[PDB]
Amino acid sequence: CSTLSLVRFLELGLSVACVCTKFPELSYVAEGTIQFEVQQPMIARDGPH
Amino acid sequence: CSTLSLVRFLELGLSVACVCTKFPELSYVAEGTIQFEVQQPMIARDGPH
Numbered sequence: 001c002s003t004l005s006l007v008r009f010l011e012l013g014l015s016v017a018c019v020c021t022k023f024p025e026l027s028y029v030a031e032g033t034i035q036f037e038v039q040q041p042m043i044a045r046d047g048p049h
Numbered sequence: 050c051s052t053l054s055l056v057r058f059l060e061l062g063l064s065v066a067c068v069c070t071k072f073p074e075l076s077y078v079a080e081g082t083i084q085f086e087v088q089q090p091m092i093a094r095d096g097p098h
Contacts, residue, residue: 001086 009015023029058064072078 002088004088004090 009020
């Protein structure tokens with residue numbers, strides 16, 4: 001009789017790609033979002049500009 | 050005069066191919082079998098099916 005070979009997602013090296021976090025009342029959540037804000041470094045032009 | 054080179058099967062390396070056993074009742078076995086119980090894994094998928 002054979003046996004199973006259990007694999008855990010964490011021992012897999014691929015888990016580095018994603019940050020899994022458990023969230024128990026996930027089904028109570030409708031379409032949520034995440035925010036962002038970004039600056040842009042600026043150069044000081046000169047003369048004919 | 051010449052002599053004969055004895056050879057012992059277990060001292061060969063081909064023995065690692067098969068397991069050997071002594072069953073002196075072999076003349077007394079009818080159609081004989083073995084068994085197997087294997088169980089493959091499975092991954093859960095989404096979708097309508």
